[PDB]
Design a protein around this ligand. Structure first.
Ligand SMILES: Nc1ncnc2c1ncn2[C@@H]1O[C@H](CSCC[C@H](N)C(=O)O)[C@@H](O)[C@H]1O
Ligand SMILES: Cc1nc(C)c(-c2cc(O)c3nc[nH]c(=O)c3c2)s1
Ligand SMILES: [Cl-]
Ligand SMILES: [Mg+2]
Length: 213
């Protein structure tokens, strides 16, 4: 089996079905005590929680699902009727994410879209009936953050006040993305210094609020 399979099995055997907090705790314990994995983690997760609570987004787009940790973490705080779409290029990851969401009882709030973000983003309006996004969580691959941000703008998917939240702007680091949003009068940016998941290594999240074209 794979590490991702081991994480999922650990949750199924150590968390309570239908209880998202217990799922997060089981994942964080596994990744602390057994095998590191690239979930946003509890330290940066607490900052995401605060952002989600502040904005109460009706429609969130996540880029990069992995095992479903951030999807569980965000979806558990959404209001009734509010929705998450998560895009995931790796089908084995998409499979784990679906089972993780099912176990957590959050499957009615979240839709996994299978494919590369750069291929799916242009389909959101016509195929997935999206008008504009309230929030986007960027957590896929560092080199995609800037191009996908510009693609989301091109496609008309951002509105005034759309919240972009980006993980790993320090490690692995997204220097082109940070230079761009921080120099652009189309964004209002805030940096949230924290730590890499499960490690005493400095990392951070960037919040960039779109201000219109
Ligand atoms: N272009 C792209 N489109 C969609 N997913 C991508 C991608 N490039 C990488 N990925 C995926 O992005 C994921 C990064 S890890 C995601 C962690 C997750 N947000 C969490 O915190 O729990 C991986 O599963 C990888 O397959
Ligand atoms: C020292 C590190 N090694 C890896 C492998 C890290 C790491 C940490 C993350 O949160 C990530 N989130 C999304 N996508 C990634 O590629 C990713 C990578 S940090
Ligand atoms: Cl952590
Ligand atoms: Mg990350």
């Amino acid at each position: 089996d794979t590490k991702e399979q081991r994480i999922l099995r650990y949750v199924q055997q150590n968390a309570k079905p239908g209880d998202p907090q217990s799922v997060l705790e089981a994942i964080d314990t596994y990744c602390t005590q057994k095998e590191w994995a690239m979930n946003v983690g509890d330290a940066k997760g607490q900052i995401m929680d605060a952002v989600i609570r502040e904005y109460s987004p009706s429609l969130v787009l996540e880029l990069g699902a992995y095992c479903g940790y951030s999807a569980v973490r965000m979806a558990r705080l959404l209001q009734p009727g509010a929705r998450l779409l998560t895009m995931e290029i790796n089908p084995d990851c998409a499979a784990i994410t679906q089972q993780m969401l099912n176990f957590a009882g959050l499957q009615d709030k979240v839709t996994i879209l299978n494919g590369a973000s750069q291929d799916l983003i242009p389909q959101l309006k016509k195929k997935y009936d999206v008008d504009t996004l309230d929030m986007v969580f960027l957590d896929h691959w560092k080199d995609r953050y800037l191009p996908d941000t510009l693609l989301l703008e091109k496609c008309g998917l951002l509105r005034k006040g759309t919240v972009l939240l980006a993980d790993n702007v320090i490690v692995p680091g997204t220097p082109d993305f940070l230079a761009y949003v921080r120099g652009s009068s189309s964004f209002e940016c805030t940096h949230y210094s924290s730590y890499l998941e499960y490690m005493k290594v400095v990392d951070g999240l960037e919040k960039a609020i779109y201000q219109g074209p």
